[PDB]
Design a protein around this ligand. Structure first.
Ligand SMILES: [Mg+2]
Ligand SMILES: [Mg+2]
Ligand SMILES: [Mg+2]
Ligand SMILES: [Mg+2]
Ligand SMILES: [Mg+2]
Ligand SMILES: [Mg+2]
Ligand SMILES: [Mg+2]
Ligand SMILES: [Mg+2]
Ligand SMILES: [Mg+2]
Ligand SMILES: [Mg+2]
Ligand SMILES: [Mg+2]
Ligand SMILES: [Mg+2]
Ligand SMILES: [Mg+2]
Ligand SMILES: [Mg+2]
Ligand SMILES: [Mg+2]
Ligand SMILES: [Mg+2]
Ligand SMILES: [Zn+2]
Lengths: 101, 55, 144, 72, 143, 124
RNA sequence: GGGCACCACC
RNA sequence: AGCGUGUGCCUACCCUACGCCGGCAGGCGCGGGUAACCCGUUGAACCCCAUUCGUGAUGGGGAUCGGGGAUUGCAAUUAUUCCCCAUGAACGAGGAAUUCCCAGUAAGUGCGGGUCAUAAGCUUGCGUUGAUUAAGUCCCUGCCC
């Protein structure tokens, strides 16, 4: 019995929510205690550049943006069941980190 | 000798210590988030990196 | 029917507390109070020669409202705008050696003590003194 | 032309202040300065003295503007 | 609030004329080499009320102010306040005043000119001295 | 009439060490000396000392040329002939006692003073 | 001869 | 208040709380943060309440210069930047001509990012205070049917 935290980081929300739902369903099918998923504030990286490769013309700017989303799940359980439920969780684009506090 | 003089000038800071990681150009460099690209190379590779234009 | 600090006007409270500190006579005053200005964005020295007591009263009131402030926090509290010639103005902080000496002088009166986390806070004696001053201010305001 | 205002009261100007100002129906440091050829600081000091003596009512006090009136 | 019987409308201090109608703190700033900070610290050191005009002062107060202004280092005025710290020729800290300042600046320029340093040459030619651009500004005063 | 640098004459200056001279100098020279001199400045000092030793008793020392325009003039250099590179030519400078604390580049100008001609067609 | 625009006007 | 940044393949260079020293720029210690966790409840500036000044190129304005001190760097002179005394120029609202703007807008006021060993009078964003005028036309300018 350990307090185990799962942190999920992703760039798109559909895959992230699908993975979170899968983990919650899998854990609750084993009659476990789950807290979350608690959603951290979204991070927005911005890069503003000039469009022209030279210095000629109207001053126009590109505004590129990247969004990072983060979820937390808490589980009171032994390590083996967590790895059992986590093995399926592998999804393209989602970074899953499991820690024992 | 030549071994001492060649490349002796320190290059631990300034424009001469930094260059683009794609074309080795020292002008218009982007250092935010550790990109280390010039603006043209970044505009060329932005979609591959993951920067999208939403506004 | 007990008056607390938040009930009364804050400016009159600061004036009364400064008068109380000056009349007490146990506050320690630096030697250079008459030759210094309070920040680098100020142009002149303070108009009031008994400015040290006023600053000590303000510091005590701030520690009452929000405890645990250090020298940097007090420096940020009393910072203001700096005009610099033909260039745009910018925010500028106060002098650290004044805030530090005000805090030390207040600790010499057994009104301010070191905080466990860091910084300084008020002792129960300092809180009692501030509440008594607030009661006096409220009574003076109501009677007149 | 240049404006040369007195910085310290004279006998005639002090008599003027004591006799005519308390009947102006609108007393203001700018008004007294313009009528008695006095600087603003001396006018403010004189008005504070008259208020202390009780010869003039005060209507409102502000850093920008102080307003006085004659007694009822 | 009435004017005192003995009132000095004009004072003569250090070959300078002082307006007796100005407040004492800003009246003595008419002396070359005395500014608001220095005048205020000198008057605070002389225990003279700052709420009175220059003409209301007695002769004792005026001579005390002059004495304190001439010799700051005796009266606990710090060295960093002075405008002629660490003289090149003799190494003495002091505050220089109306005519002394005028000839001290002249000697400072002459030293640079005689040694033929770049700053002295720029002073001699009449051009800017602290590295400013001269292409577009500073035209005033030139033909 | 006798030269003094901040109340100190030339002989005492020559006797003093670098730590004593740090307090006489200004903030920039003091910081430079506190950070220390490198090999090239020491080589220049050695060459100047060698040149001054070989001077005839009534003659001036041989001119020593250098590119070091950021060299600080020490009291030991007074009386030496230094050619300072300005980018194109070595200008000859005799070190006077009143140059103590300045740089060498302050005495070899790097540009020709402007004498203006008639403005061209492209000026309006 | 019509229509539009605070990179036009009122 | 709000938007954001923060210890980096090469690559050296991060954001800073608290205690002491200095009048200030700064210097010493000793901690947190790879971050809704620490700076940070981001005690911002205008604004508000009192004090002094009193139509005086004035305590408006802060250019140009003198002497000192400290930080970044291998190196500061042709002043990198910063701090302290001192000096105290034009300027009293701007000719012909001409720019931008219709609601949380114009303007005022600060704060982040880029550049950045040192670093904003520029740019790109963010808040805070907050309007006058107009709901029309083809007269000027220009573009289309
Ligand atoms: Mg403030
Ligand atoms: Mg300004
Ligand atoms: Mg003066
Ligand atoms: Mg320059
Ligand atoms: Mg010019
Ligand atoms: Mg119009
Ligand atoms: Mg003036
Ligand atoms: Mg002025
Ligand atoms: Mg200097
Ligand atoms: Mg040049
Ligand atoms: Mg000044
Ligand atoms: Mg137009
Ligand atoms: Mg900005
Ligand atoms: Mg910056
Ligand atoms: Mg630019
Ligand atoms: Mg038309
Ligand atoms: Zn490139």
């Amino acid at each position: 019995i350990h307090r185990i935290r799962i942190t999920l980081t992703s760039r798109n929300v559909k895959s992230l929510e699908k993975v979170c739902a899968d983990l919650i369903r899998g854990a609750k099918e084993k009659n476990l205690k789950v807290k979350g998923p608690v959603r951290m504030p979204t991070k927005t990286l911005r890069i503003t550049t000039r469009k022209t490769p030279c210095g000629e013309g109207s001053k126009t700017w590109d505004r590129f943006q990247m969004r990072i989303h983060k979820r937390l799940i808490d589980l009171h359980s032994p390590s083996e069941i967590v790895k059992q439920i986590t093995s399926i969780s592998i999804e393209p684009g989602v970074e899953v980190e499991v820690t024992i506090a | 000798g030549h071994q001492q003089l060649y490349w002796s000038h320190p290059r631990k800071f300034g424009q001469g210590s930094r260059s683009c990681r794609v074309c080795s150009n020292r002008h218009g460099l982007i250092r935010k988030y550790g990109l280390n690209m010039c603006r043209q190379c970044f505009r060329q590779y932005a979609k591959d990196i993951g920067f999208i234009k939403l506004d | 029917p007990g008056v607390t600090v938040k009930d009364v006007n804050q400016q009159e409270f600061v004036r009364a507390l400064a008068a109380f500190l000056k009349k007490s006579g146990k506050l320690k005053v630096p030697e250079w109070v008459d030759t210094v200005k309070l920040a680098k964005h100020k142009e002149l020295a303070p108009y009031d020669e008994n400015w040290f007591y006023t600053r000590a009263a303000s510091t005590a009131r701030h520690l009452y409202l929000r405890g645990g402030a250090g020298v940097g926090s007090m420096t940020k509290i009393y910072g203001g705008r700096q005009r610099n010639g033909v260039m745009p103005s910018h925010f500028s902080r106060g002098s650290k050696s004044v805030a530090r000496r005000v805090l030390q002088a207040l600790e010499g009166l057994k009104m301010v003590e070191k905080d466990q986390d860091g910084g300084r806070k008020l002792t129960p004696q300092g809180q009692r003194d501030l509440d008594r001053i607030a009661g006096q201010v409220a009574a003076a305001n109501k009677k007149h | 032309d240049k404006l040369n205002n007195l910085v310290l009261f004279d006998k005639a100007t002090y008599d003027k202040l004591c006799k005519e100002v308390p009947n102006y129906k609108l007393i203001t440091p700018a008004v007294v300065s313009e009528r008695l050829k006095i600087r603003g600081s001396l006018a403010r000091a004189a008005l504070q003295e008259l208020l202390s003596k009780g010869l003039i009512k005060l209507v409102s006090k502000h850093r920008a503007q102080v307003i006085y009136t004659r007694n009822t | 609030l009435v004017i005192p019987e003995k009132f000095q409308h004009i004072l003569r201090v250090l070959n300078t004329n002082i307006d007796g109608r100005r407040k004492i703190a800003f009246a003595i700033t008419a002396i070359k080499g005395v500014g608001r900070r220095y005048a205020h610290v000198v008057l605070r050191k002389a225990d003279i009320d700052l709420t009175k005009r220059a003409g209301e002062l007695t002769e004792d107060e005026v001579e005390r102010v002059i004495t304190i202004m001439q010799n700051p280092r005796q009266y606990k005025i710090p060295d960093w306040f002075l405008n002629r710290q660490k003289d090149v020729k003799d190494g003495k800290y002091s505050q220089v005043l109306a005519n002394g300042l005028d000839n001290k600046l002249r000697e400072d320029l002459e030293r640079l000119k005689k040694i033929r340093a770049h700053r002295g040459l720029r002073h001699f030619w009449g051009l800017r001295v602290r590295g400013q651009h001269t292409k577009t500004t500073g035209r005033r005063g030139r033909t | 009439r006798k030269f003094t640098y901040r109340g100190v004459d030339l002989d005492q200056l020559l006797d003093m060490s670098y730590e004593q001279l740090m307090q006489l100098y200004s903030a920039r020279q003091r910081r430079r000396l506190n950070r220390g001199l490198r090999r090239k400045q020491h080589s220049l000092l050695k060459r100047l000392r060698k040149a001054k030793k070989e001077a005839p008793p009534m003659e001036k020392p041989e001119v020593v040329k250098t590119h070091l325009r950021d060299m600080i003039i020490l009291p030991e250099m007074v009386g030496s002939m230094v050619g300072v590179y300005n980018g194109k030519t070595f200008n000859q400078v005799e070190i006077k006692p009143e140059m103590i604390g300045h740089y060498l580049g302050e005495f070899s100008i790097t540009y020709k003073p402007v004498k203006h001609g008639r403005p061209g067609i492209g000026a309006t």
